[PDB]
Every structure is written in C-alpha cells, then in structure tokens.
Amino acid sequence: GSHMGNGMTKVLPGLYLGNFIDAKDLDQLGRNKITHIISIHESPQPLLQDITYLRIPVADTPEVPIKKHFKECINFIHCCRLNGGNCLVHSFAGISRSTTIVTAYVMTVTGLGWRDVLEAIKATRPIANPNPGFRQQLEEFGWASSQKLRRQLEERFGE
Ligand SMILES: CCCCCCCCO[C@@H]1O[C@H](CO)[C@@H](O)[C@H](O)[C@H]1O
C-alpha cells in the first residue's frame, strides 16, 4: 500500500515531479504550496488561478530536442525556488519528459552527471525514465551547458 507514488514526488525543497493528474489535483497543489508549474504537453490546457505557468509544447519521442528548452526551464525553476515558491514540472505519464527537465536542473545546481542524478531521482520516484533520445541530450547538456548555466544562475539570481 505504502509505495513512493502518491501524487507529485518531491525532488528537492521547492521542486516536484508529476503527471497530468497531479497537475490538476487542487488538494496536492495546496498541500505542497505549488506556486509555479512547467507544463510539457503537446497542447495548451486550462490554467489554474494563482499559479504561474511555463508552457513547453513537446511530445515524448527520442527525436524531439527538449534540450532547446533546458535553459529557460532551469531559469524558471531557479527563480521560483530562490524567491520562496514551489515548482511542479509535469508531463502526461509522469515518466520521461518532466523527468528530463528536472534532471537537467539538478545536474546544473549539483554539478553531478545525469546518471547519478537520474538514479537519485529514481529513489524517490521509481517510474522515472526519460526516453533514449532525451538521455543522450542529457549527456550533451552535462558536458557542455551544465556548468556554464550554474555560473549564469548565480549571476542572474545570486547564490
Ligand atoms: C498514462 C495513461 C494514458 C492513458 C491513455 C491516454 C491516451 C491519450 O494519450 C496521451 O496523449 C497526450 C497528448 O494529448 C500525450 O502527451 C501522451 O503521451 C499520450 O499518452
């Protein structure tokens, strides 16, 4: 009965992962004081009041370059966290798309690789599994952009 899978999962203070159901769960949203949400869905959806949204129209296929949205998502999340908010990143199944964006974020703030990060995320959400293509994009991001972004965030929002 008690399995780590009852609503969005806390990934870090002020950061959560979820599916389309958690994204509409007012009880969950209130419980976790969610003030920001990143919706990674192919189509626009009615937005809940008192929440700041970031829409990322991307499908879950290994050919889709979600890496093109890493910078903006990480900046959105960071701003929200360092300013006392709570961000929920979600995708329909709560499996690969939202997971990819959050992994990229944690990689930049910790300086750790995507495998260790993904494995750490799985501990608190065993369904976590970005598609093969997103994992490669995570590979790139780790090598290239990760570190630069960390320094950038420090500049834009401070440490
Ligand atoms: C996870 C449970 C899925 C139950 C059947 C869902 C059928 C709709 O399918 C869903 O369409 C969405 C776009 O509209 C896609 O983003 C999702 O990946 C896709 O599963």
mmCIF file with all atom_site columns, C-alpha atoms and ligand atoms in Angstrom:
data_model
loop_
_atom_site.group_PDB
_atom_site.id
_atom_site.type_symbol
_atom_site.label_atom_id
_atom_site.label_alt_id
_atom_site.label_comp_id
_atom_site.label_asym_id
_atom_site.label_entity_id
_atom_site.label_seq_id
_atom_site.pdbx_PDB_ins_code
_atom_site.Cartn_x
_atom_site.Cartn_y
_atom_site.Cartn_z
_atom_site.occupancy
_atom_site.B_iso_or_equiv
_atom_site.pdbx_formal_charge
_atom_site.auth_seq_id
_atom_site.auth_comp_id
_atom_site.auth_asym_id
_atom_site.auth_atom_id
_atom_site.pdbx_PDB_model_num
ATOM   1   C CA  . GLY A 1 1   ? 0.000  0.000  0.000   1.00 0.00 ? 1   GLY A CA  1
ATOM   2   C CA  . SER A 1 2   ? 2.722  2.417  1.049   1.00 0.00 ? 2   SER A CA  1
ATOM   3   C CA  . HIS A 1 3   ? 4.814  2.881  -2.106  1.00 0.00 ? 3   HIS A CA  1
ATOM   4   C CA  . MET A 1 4   ? 6.555  6.107  -3.100  1.00 0.00 ? 4   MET A CA  1
ATOM   5   C CA  . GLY A 1 5   ? 3.900  7.060  -5.623  1.00 0.00 ? 5   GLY A CA  1
ATOM   6   C CA  . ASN A 1 6   ? 1.025  9.108  -4.202  1.00 0.00 ? 6   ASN A CA  1
ATOM   7   C CA  . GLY A 1 7   ? 0.880  12.337 -6.141  1.00 0.00 ? 7   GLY A CA  1
ATOM   8   C CA  . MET A 1 8   ? 3.743  14.520 -7.272  1.00 0.00 ? 8   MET A CA  1
ATOM   9   C CA  . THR A 1 9   ? 7.099  13.497 -5.843  1.00 0.00 ? 9   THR A CA  1
ATOM   10  C CA  . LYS A 1 10  ? 9.387  15.932 -4.029  1.00 0.00 ? 10  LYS A CA  1
ATOM   11  C CA  . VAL A 1 11  ? 12.692 16.066 -5.897  1.00 0.00 ? 11  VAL A CA  1
ATOM   12  C CA  . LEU A 1 12  ? 14.223 18.898 -3.907  1.00 0.00 ? 12  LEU A CA  1
ATOM   13  C CA  . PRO A 1 13  ? 12.883 21.539 -1.500  1.00 0.00 ? 13  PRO A CA  1
ATOM   14  C CA  . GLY A 1 14  ? 10.618 23.639 -3.725  1.00 0.00 ? 14  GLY A CA  1
ATOM   15  C CA  . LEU A 1 15  ? 10.693 21.228 -6.708  1.00 0.00 ? 15  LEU A CA  1
ATOM   16  C CA  . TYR A 1 16  ? 8.299  18.432 -7.725  1.00 0.00 ? 16  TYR A CA  1
ATOM   17  C CA  . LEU A 1 17  ? 7.659  15.897 -10.487 1.00 0.00 ? 17  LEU A CA  1
ATOM   18  C CA  . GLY A 1 18  ? 4.208  14.805 -11.580 1.00 0.00 ? 18  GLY A CA  1
ATOM   19  C CA  . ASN A 1 19  ? 1.752  13.616 -14.213 1.00 0.00 ? 19  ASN A CA  1
ATOM   20  C CA  . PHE A 1 20  ? -1.359 15.213 -15.750 1.00 0.00 ? 20  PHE A CA  1
ATOM   21  C CA  . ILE A 1 21  ? -3.449 14.080 -12.778 1.00 0.00 ? 21  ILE A CA  1
ATOM   22  C CA  . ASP A 1 22  ? -1.188 15.662 -10.143 1.00 0.00 ? 22  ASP A CA  1
ATOM   23  C CA  . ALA A 1 23  ? -1.178 18.880 -12.193 1.00 0.00 ? 23  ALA A CA  1
ATOM   24  C CA  . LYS A 1 24  ? -4.949 19.233 -11.606 1.00 0.00 ? 24  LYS A CA  1
ATOM   25  C CA  . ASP A 1 25  ? -5.045 17.900 -8.056  1.00 0.00 ? 25  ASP A CA  1
ATOM   26  C CA  . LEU A 1 26  ? -6.035 21.023 -6.082  1.00 0.00 ? 26  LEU A CA  1
ATOM   27  C CA  . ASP A 1 27  ? -5.501 19.141 -2.845  1.00 0.00 ? 27  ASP A CA  1
ATOM   28  C CA  . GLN A 1 28  ? -1.950 18.218 -3.849  1.00 0.00 ? 28  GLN A CA  1
ATOM   29  C CA  . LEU A 1 29  ? -1.301 21.701 -5.194  1.00 0.00 ? 29  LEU A CA  1
ATOM   30  C CA  . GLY A 1 30  ? -2.394 23.285 -1.925  1.00 0.00 ? 30  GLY A CA  1
ATOM   31  C CA  . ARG A 1 31  ? -0.706 20.715 0.280   1.00 0.00 ? 31  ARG A CA  1
ATOM   32  C CA  . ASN A 1 32  ? 2.624  21.353 -1.465  1.00 0.00 ? 32  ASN A CA  1
ATOM   33  C CA  . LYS A 1 33  ? 2.031  25.116 -1.824  1.00 0.00 ? 33  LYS A CA  1
ATOM   34  C CA  . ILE A 1 34  ? 2.808  24.850 -5.545  1.00 0.00 ? 34  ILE A CA  1
ATOM   35  C CA  . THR A 1 35  ? 3.164  28.367 -6.979  1.00 0.00 ? 35  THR A CA  1
ATOM   36  C CA  . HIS A 1 36  ? 4.781  27.503 -10.304 1.00 0.00 ? 36  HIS A CA  1
ATOM   37  C CA  . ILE A 1 37  ? 4.290  24.817 -12.905 1.00 0.00 ? 37  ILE A CA  1
ATOM   38  C CA  . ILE A 1 38  ? 6.015  23.857 -16.104 1.00 0.00 ? 38  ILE A CA  1
ATOM   39  C CA  . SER A 1 39  ? 3.639  22.022 -18.403 1.00 0.00 ? 39  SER A CA  1
ATOM   40  C CA  . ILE A 1 40  ? 5.320  19.867 -21.030 1.00 0.00 ? 40  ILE A CA  1
ATOM   41  C CA  . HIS A 1 41  ? 2.333  18.881 -23.150 1.00 0.00 ? 41  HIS A CA  1
ATOM   42  C CA  . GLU A 1 42  ? 1.713  18.974 -26.908 1.00 0.00 ? 42  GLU A CA  1
ATOM   43  C CA  . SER A 1 43  ? -1.417 21.115 -26.487 1.00 0.00 ? 43  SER A CA  1
ATOM   44  C CA  . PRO A 1 44  ? -2.468 24.141 -24.352 1.00 0.00 ? 44  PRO A CA  1
ATOM   45  C CA  . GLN A 1 45  ? -4.514 23.375 -21.235 1.00 0.00 ? 45  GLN A CA  1
ATOM   46  C CA  . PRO A 1 46  ? -6.766 25.484 -18.980 1.00 0.00 ? 46  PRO A CA  1
ATOM   47  C CA  . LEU A 1 47  ? -4.529 27.155 -16.389 1.00 0.00 ? 47  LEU A CA  1
ATOM   48  C CA  . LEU A 1 48  ? -5.345 27.197 -12.668 1.00 0.00 ? 48  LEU A CA  1
ATOM   49  C CA  . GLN A 1 49  ? -5.575 30.541 -10.877 1.00 0.00 ? 49  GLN A CA  1
ATOM   50  C CA  . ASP A 1 50  ? -2.786 31.787 -8.642  1.00 0.00 ? 50  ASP A CA  1
ATOM   51  C CA  . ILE A 1 51  ? -0.143 29.723 -10.429 1.00 0.00 ? 51  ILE A CA  1
ATOM   52  C CA  . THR A 1 52  ? 2.496  30.898 -12.884 1.00 0.00 ? 52  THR A CA  1
ATOM   53  C CA  . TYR A 1 53  ? 2.807  28.592 -15.876 1.00 0.00 ? 53  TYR A CA  1
ATOM   54  C CA  . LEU A 1 54  ? 5.505  27.920 -18.392 1.00 0.00 ? 54  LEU A CA  1
ATOM   55  C CA  . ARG A 1 55  ? 4.230  26.045 -21.439 1.00 0.00 ? 55  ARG A CA  1
ATOM   56  C CA  . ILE A 1 56  ? 6.579  23.661 -23.237 1.00 0.00 ? 56  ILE A CA  1
ATOM   57  C CA  . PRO A 1 57  ? 4.765  22.042 -26.238 1.00 0.00 ? 57  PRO A CA  1
ATOM   58  C CA  . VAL A 1 58  ? 6.853  18.912 -26.666 1.00 0.00 ? 58  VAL A CA  1
ATOM   59  C CA  . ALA A 1 59  ? 5.915  15.305 -27.389 1.00 0.00 ? 59  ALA A CA  1
ATOM   60  C CA  . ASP A 1 60  ? 7.599  12.273 -25.829 1.00 0.00 ? 60  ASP A CA  1
ATOM   61  C CA  . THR A 1 61  ? 9.752  10.940 -28.685 1.00 0.00 ? 61  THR A CA  1
ATOM   62  C CA  . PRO A 1 62  ? 13.542 10.483 -28.729 1.00 0.00 ? 62  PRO A CA  1
ATOM   63  C CA  . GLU A 1 63  ? 13.879 12.772 -31.756 1.00 0.00 ? 63  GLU A CA  1
ATOM   64  C CA  . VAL A 1 64  ? 12.361 15.819 -30.076 1.00 0.00 ? 64  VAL A CA  1
ATOM   65  C CA  . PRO A 1 65  ? 15.031 18.327 -28.992 1.00 0.00 ? 65  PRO A CA  1
ATOM   66  C CA  . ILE A 1 66  ? 13.761 19.192 -25.487 1.00 0.00 ? 66  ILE A CA  1
ATOM   67  C CA  . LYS A 1 67  ? 17.326 20.350 -24.887 1.00 0.00 ? 67  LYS A CA  1
ATOM   68  C CA  . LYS A 1 68  ? 16.298 23.561 -26.611 1.00 0.00 ? 68  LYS A CA  1
ATOM   69  C CA  . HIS A 1 69  ? 14.132 24.337 -23.577 1.00 0.00 ? 69  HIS A CA  1
ATOM   70  C CA  . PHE A 1 70  ? 16.623 23.418 -20.837 1.00 0.00 ? 70  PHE A CA  1
ATOM   71  C CA  . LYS A 1 71  ? 17.933 26.945 -20.271 1.00 0.00 ? 71  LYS A CA  1
ATOM   72  C CA  . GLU A 1 72  ? 14.558 28.621 -19.956 1.00 0.00 ? 72  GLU A CA  1
ATOM   73  C CA  . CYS A 1 73  ? 13.127 25.839 -17.752 1.00 0.00 ? 73  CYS A CA  1
ATOM   74  C CA  . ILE A 1 74  ? 16.097 25.840 -15.406 1.00 0.00 ? 74  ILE A CA  1
ATOM   75  C CA  . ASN A 1 75  ? 15.926 29.628 -15.128 1.00 0.00 ? 75  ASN A CA  1
ATOM   76  C CA  . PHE A 1 76  ? 12.205 29.464 -14.422 1.00 0.00 ? 76  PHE A CA  1
ATOM   77  C CA  . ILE A 1 77  ? 12.656 26.818 -11.714 1.00 0.00 ? 77  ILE A CA  1
ATOM   78  C CA  . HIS A 1 78  ? 15.606 28.542 -10.064 1.00 0.00 ? 78  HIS A CA  1
ATOM   79  C CA  . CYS A 1 79  ? 13.893 31.938 -9.928  1.00 0.00 ? 79  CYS A CA  1
ATOM   80  C CA  . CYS A 1 80  ? 10.870 30.274 -8.349  1.00 0.00 ? 80  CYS A CA  1
ATOM   81  C CA  . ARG A 1 81  ? 12.913 28.388 -5.739  1.00 0.00 ? 81  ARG A CA  1
ATOM   82  C CA  . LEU A 1 82  ? 15.231 31.197 -4.643  1.00 0.00 ? 82  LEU A CA  1
ATOM   83  C CA  . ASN A 1 83  ? 12.223 33.506 -4.348  1.00 0.00 ? 83  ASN A CA  1
ATOM   84  C CA  . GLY A 1 84  ? 10.297 31.272 -1.952  1.00 0.00 ? 84  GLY A CA  1
ATOM   85  C CA  . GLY A 1 85  ? 7.990  29.433 -4.344  1.00 0.00 ? 85  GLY A CA  1
ATOM   86  C CA  . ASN A 1 86  ? 7.371  25.800 -5.277  1.00 0.00 ? 86  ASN A CA  1
ATOM   87  C CA  . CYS A 1 87  ? 7.616  24.405 -8.780  1.00 0.00 ? 87  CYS A CA  1
ATOM   88  C CA  . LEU A 1 88  ? 5.876  21.350 -10.179 1.00 0.00 ? 88  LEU A CA  1
ATOM   89  C CA  . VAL A 1 89  ? 7.183  20.070 -13.503 1.00 0.00 ? 89  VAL A CA  1
ATOM   90  C CA  . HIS A 1 90  ? 4.836  17.612 -15.217 1.00 0.00 ? 90  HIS A CA  1
ATOM   91  C CA  . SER A 1 91  ? 4.201  15.615 -18.390 1.00 0.00 ? 91  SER A CA  1
ATOM   92  C CA  . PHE A 1 92  ? 1.261  13.298 -19.136 1.00 0.00 ? 92  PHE A CA  1
ATOM   93  C CA  . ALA A 1 93  ? 2.552  9.924  -17.909 1.00 0.00 ? 93  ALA A CA  1
ATOM   94  C CA  . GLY A 1 94  ? 4.958  11.413 -15.404 1.00 0.00 ? 94  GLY A CA  1
ATOM   95  C CA  . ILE A 1 95  ? 7.689  9.245  -16.907 1.00 0.00 ? 95  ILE A CA  1
ATOM   96  C CA  . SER A 1 96  ? 10.171 10.804 -19.326 1.00 0.00 ? 96  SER A CA  1
ATOM   97  C CA  . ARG A 1 97  ? 9.551  14.455 -20.352 1.00 0.00 ? 97  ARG A CA  1
ATOM   98  C CA  . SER A 1 98  ? 9.190  16.090 -16.920 1.00 0.00 ? 98  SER A CA  1
ATOM   99  C CA  . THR A 1 99  ? 11.955 13.823 -15.643 1.00 0.00 ? 99  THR A CA  1
ATOM   100 C CA  . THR A 1 100 ? 14.366 15.048 -18.314 1.00 0.00 ? 100 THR A CA  1
ATOM   101 C CA  . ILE A 1 101 ? 13.797 18.719 -17.474 1.00 0.00 ? 101 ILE A CA  1
ATOM   102 C CA  . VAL A 1 102 ? 14.215 18.171 -13.716 1.00 0.00 ? 102 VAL A CA  1
ATOM   103 C CA  . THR A 1 103 ? 17.361 16.048 -14.175 1.00 0.00 ? 103 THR A CA  1
ATOM   104 C CA  . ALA A 1 104 ? 18.937 18.813 -16.227 1.00 0.00 ? 104 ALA A CA  1
ATOM   105 C CA  . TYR A 1 105 ? 18.109 21.261 -13.432 1.00 0.00 ? 105 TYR A CA  1
ATOM   106 C CA  . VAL A 1 106 ? 19.583 19.130 -10.663 1.00 0.00 ? 106 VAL A CA  1
ATOM   107 C CA  . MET A 1 107 ? 22.654 18.481 -12.792 1.00 0.00 ? 107 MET A CA  1
ATOM   108 C CA  . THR A 1 108 ? 23.387 22.208 -13.013 1.00 0.00 ? 108 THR A CA  1
ATOM   109 C CA  . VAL A 1 109 ? 22.801 23.025 -9.324  1.00 0.00 ? 109 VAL A CA  1
ATOM   110 C CA  . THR A 1 110 ? 24.781 19.996 -8.087  1.00 0.00 ? 110 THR A CA  1
ATOM   111 C CA  . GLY A 1 111 ? 27.390 19.688 -10.831 1.00 0.00 ? 111 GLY A CA  1
ATOM   112 C CA  . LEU A 1 112 ? 26.699 15.946 -10.930 1.00 0.00 ? 112 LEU A CA  1
ATOM   113 C CA  . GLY A 1 113 ? 26.191 13.751 -14.014 1.00 0.00 ? 113 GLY A CA  1
ATOM   114 C CA  . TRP A 1 114 ? 22.802 12.701 -15.384 1.00 0.00 ? 114 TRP A CA  1
ATOM   115 C CA  . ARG A 1 115 ? 23.213 9.071  -14.369 1.00 0.00 ? 115 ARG A CA  1
ATOM   116 C CA  . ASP A 1 116 ? 23.836 9.793  -10.694 1.00 0.00 ? 116 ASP A CA  1
ATOM   117 C CA  . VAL A 1 117 ? 21.082 12.419 -10.794 1.00 0.00 ? 117 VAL A CA  1
ATOM   118 C CA  . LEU A 1 118 ? 18.583 10.115 -12.525 1.00 0.00 ? 118 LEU A CA  1
ATOM   119 C CA  . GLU A 1 119 ? 19.431 7.292  -10.105 1.00 0.00 ? 119 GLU A CA  1
ATOM   120 C CA  . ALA A 1 120 ? 18.946 9.694  -7.210  1.00 0.00 ? 120 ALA A CA  1
ATOM   121 C CA  . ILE A 1 121 ? 15.599 10.775 -8.633  1.00 0.00 ? 121 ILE A CA  1
ATOM   122 C CA  . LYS A 1 122 ? 14.516 7.139  -9.101  1.00 0.00 ? 122 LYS A CA  1
ATOM   123 C CA  . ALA A 1 123 ? 14.985 6.588  -5.363  1.00 0.00 ? 123 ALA A CA  1
ATOM   124 C CA  . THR A 1 124 ? 12.054 8.960  -4.788  1.00 0.00 ? 124 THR A CA  1
ATOM   125 C CA  . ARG A 1 125 ? 10.166 8.052  -7.958  1.00 0.00 ? 125 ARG A CA  1
ATOM   126 C CA  . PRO A 1 126 ? 10.986 4.576  -9.400  1.00 0.00 ? 126 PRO A CA  1
ATOM   127 C CA  . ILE A 1 127 ? 8.895  5.170  -12.520 1.00 0.00 ? 127 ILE A CA  1
ATOM   128 C CA  . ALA A 1 128 ? 11.339 7.908  -13.576 1.00 0.00 ? 128 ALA A CA  1
ATOM   129 C CA  . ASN A 1 129 ? 12.624 7.096  -17.039 1.00 0.00 ? 129 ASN A CA  1
ATOM   130 C CA  . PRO A 1 130 ? 13.494 9.574  -19.789 1.00 0.00 ? 130 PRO A CA  1
ATOM   131 C CA  . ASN A 1 131 ? 13.392 8.135  -23.313 1.00 0.00 ? 131 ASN A CA  1
ATOM   132 C CA  . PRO A 1 132 ? 16.686 7.046  -25.000 1.00 0.00 ? 132 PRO A CA  1
ATOM   133 C CA  . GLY A 1 133 ? 16.909 10.269 -27.005 1.00 0.00 ? 133 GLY A CA  1
ATOM   134 C CA  . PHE A 1 134 ? 16.443 12.533 -24.003 1.00 0.00 ? 134 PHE A CA  1
ATOM   135 C CA  . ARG A 1 135 ? 19.177 10.651 -22.159 1.00 0.00 ? 135 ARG A CA  1
ATOM   136 C CA  . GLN A 1 136 ? 21.644 11.490 -24.950 1.00 0.00 ? 136 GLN A CA  1
ATOM   137 C CA  . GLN A 1 137 ? 20.534 15.107 -24.845 1.00 0.00 ? 137 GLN A CA  1
ATOM   138 C CA  . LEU A 1 138 ? 21.138 14.943 -21.094 1.00 0.00 ? 138 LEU A CA  1
ATOM   139 C CA  . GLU A 1 139 ? 24.593 13.553 -21.902 1.00 0.00 ? 139 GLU A CA  1
ATOM   140 C CA  . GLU A 1 140 ? 25.326 16.589 -24.090 1.00 0.00 ? 140 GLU A CA  1
ATOM   141 C CA  . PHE A 1 141 ? 23.958 19.052 -21.551 1.00 0.00 ? 141 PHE A CA  1
ATOM   142 C CA  . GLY A 1 142 ? 26.146 17.556 -18.850 1.00 0.00 ? 142 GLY A CA  1
ATOM   143 C CA  . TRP A 1 143 ? 29.296 18.025 -20.897 1.00 0.00 ? 143 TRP A CA  1
ATOM   144 C CA  . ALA A 1 144 ? 28.525 21.399 -22.471 1.00 0.00 ? 144 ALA A CA  1
ATOM   145 C CA  . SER A 1 145 ? 25.939 23.664 -20.840 1.00 0.00 ? 145 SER A CA  1
ATOM   146 C CA  . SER A 1 146 ? 25.529 22.415 -17.258 1.00 0.00 ? 146 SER A CA  1
ATOM   147 C CA  . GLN A 1 147 ? 28.493 24.201 -15.617 1.00 0.00 ? 147 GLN A CA  1
ATOM   148 C CA  . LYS A 1 148 ? 28.063 27.410 -17.653 1.00 0.00 ? 148 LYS A CA  1
ATOM   149 C CA  . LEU A 1 149 ? 24.442 27.586 -16.603 1.00 0.00 ? 149 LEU A CA  1
ATOM   150 C CA  . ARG A 1 150 ? 25.306 27.159 -12.915 1.00 0.00 ? 150 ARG A CA  1
ATOM   151 C CA  . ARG A 1 151 ? 27.598 30.190 -13.094 1.00 0.00 ? 151 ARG A CA  1
ATOM   152 C CA  . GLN A 1 152 ? 24.912 32.058 -15.068 1.00 0.00 ? 152 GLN A CA  1
ATOM   153 C CA  . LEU A 1 153 ? 22.190 31.390 -12.482 1.00 0.00 ? 153 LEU A CA  1
ATOM   154 C CA  . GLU A 1 154 ? 24.493 32.721 -9.776  1.00 0.00 ? 154 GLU A CA  1
ATOM   155 C CA  . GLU A 1 155 ? 24.789 35.920 -11.804 1.00 0.00 ? 155 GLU A CA  1
ATOM   156 C CA  . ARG A 1 156 ? 21.078 36.321 -12.566 1.00 0.00 ? 156 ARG A CA  1
ATOM   157 C CA  . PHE A 1 157 ? 19.701 35.410 -9.144  1.00 0.00 ? 157 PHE A CA  1
ATOM   158 C CA  . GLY A 1 158 ? 22.695 35.269 -6.824  1.00 0.00 ? 158 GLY A CA  1
ATOM   159 C CA  . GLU A 1 159 ? 23.889 32.305 -4.746  1.00 0.00 ? 159 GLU A CA  1
HETATM 160 C C1  . LIG B 2 .   ? -0.718 7.361  -18.863 1.00 0.00 ? 1   LIG B C1  1
HETATM 161 C C2  . LIG B 2 .   ? -2.136 6.919  -19.105 1.00 0.00 ? 1   LIG B C2  1
HETATM 162 C C3  . LIG B 2 .   ? -2.507 7.102  -20.553 1.00 0.00 ? 1   LIG B C3  1
HETATM 163 C C4  . LIG B 2 .   ? -3.945 6.663  -20.801 1.00 0.00 ? 1   LIG B C4  1
HETATM 164 C C5  . LIG B 2 .   ? -4.388 6.836  -22.259 1.00 0.00 ? 1   LIG B C5  1
HETATM 165 C C6  . LIG B 2 .   ? -4.029 8.214  -22.788 1.00 0.00 ? 1   LIG B C6  1
HETATM 166 C C7  . LIG B 2 .   ? -4.455 8.435  -24.224 1.00 0.00 ? 1   LIG B C7  1
HETATM 167 C C8  . LIG B 2 .   ? -4.024 9.820  -24.658 1.00 0.00 ? 1   LIG B C8  1
HETATM 168 O O1  . LIG B 2 .   ? -2.633 9.703  -24.996 1.00 0.00 ? 1   LIG B O1  1
HETATM 169 C C9  . LIG B 2 .   ? -1.790 10.748 -24.498 1.00 0.00 ? 1   LIG B C9  1
HETATM 170 O O2  . LIG B 2 .   ? -1.922 11.949 -25.317 1.00 0.00 ? 1   LIG B O2  1
HETATM 171 C C10 . LIG B 2 .   ? -1.095 13.058 -24.879 1.00 0.00 ? 1   LIG B C10 1
HETATM 172 C C11 . LIG B 2 .   ? -1.322 14.254 -25.803 1.00 0.00 ? 1   LIG B C11 1
HETATM 173 O O3  . LIG B 2 .   ? -2.700 14.582 -25.870 1.00 0.00 ? 1   LIG B O3  1
HETATM 174 C C12 . LIG B 2 .   ? 0.396  12.618 -24.919 1.00 0.00 ? 1   LIG B C12 1
HETATM 175 O O4  . LIG B 2 .   ? 1.223  13.671 -24.462 1.00 0.00 ? 1   LIG B O4  1
HETATM 176 C C13 . LIG B 2 .   ? 0.596  11.400 -24.025 1.00 0.00 ? 1   LIG B C13 1
HETATM 177 O O5  . LIG B 2 .   ? 1.949  10.992 -24.075 1.00 0.00 ? 1   LIG B O5  1
HETATM 178 C C14 . LIG B 2 .   ? -0.309 10.276 -24.538 1.00 0.00 ? 1   LIG B C14 1
HETATM 179 O O6  . LIG B 2 .   ? -0.143 9.127  -23.727 1.00 0.00 ? 1   LIG B O6  1
#
